[PDB]
């Protein structure tokens, strides 16, 4: 079972991106998926969860109504869409998703340290 990502590219500010979150062998429709970004020599931070029943938790309090999270049942996949983007946002983004802790997008450090499956990350660049 396996969690990859896509999405990521190098836009300038003011663009967006969409970023999905695709499981291999199993449905995310039971599960919390949480978004995570991280620059090498910092510590992951999160930003977005959505949760096994679909309410979206905010991990960041900043520029909330840029990030949008969705769940397509039907690909079996997870997207982070990131609206007007800006430098400050570049970064590896990565999805998580839990076996403990039962569909719930917790808060971003315990969910970051339940997580069981990691996607491999994407680059997202803002210049």
């Known amino acids: 079972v396996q969690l990859v990502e896509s999405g990521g590219g190098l836009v300038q500010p003011g663009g967006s991106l969409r970023l999905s979150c695709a499981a291999t062998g199993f449905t995310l429709e039971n599960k919390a998926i949480g978004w995570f970004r991280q620059t090498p020599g910092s510590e992951r931070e999160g930003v977005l969860c959505?949760?096994?029943?679909?309410?979206?938790?905010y991990y960041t309090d900043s520029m909330r109504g840029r990030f949008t999270i969705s769940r397509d049942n039907a690909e079996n996949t997870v997207y982070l869409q990131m609206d007007s983007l800006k430098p400050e946002d570049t970064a590896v983004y990565y999805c998580?998703?839990?076996?403990?802790?039962?569909?719930?997008?917790?808060?971003?450090?315990?969910?970051?340290?339940?997580?069981?499956?990691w996607g491999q990350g994407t680059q997202v660049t803002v210049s």
């Open positions: 998580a998703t839990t076996t403990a802790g039962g569909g719930l997008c917790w808060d971003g450090t315990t969910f970051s340290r339940l997580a069981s499956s």
């Open positions: 959505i949760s096994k029943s679909g309410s979206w938790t």
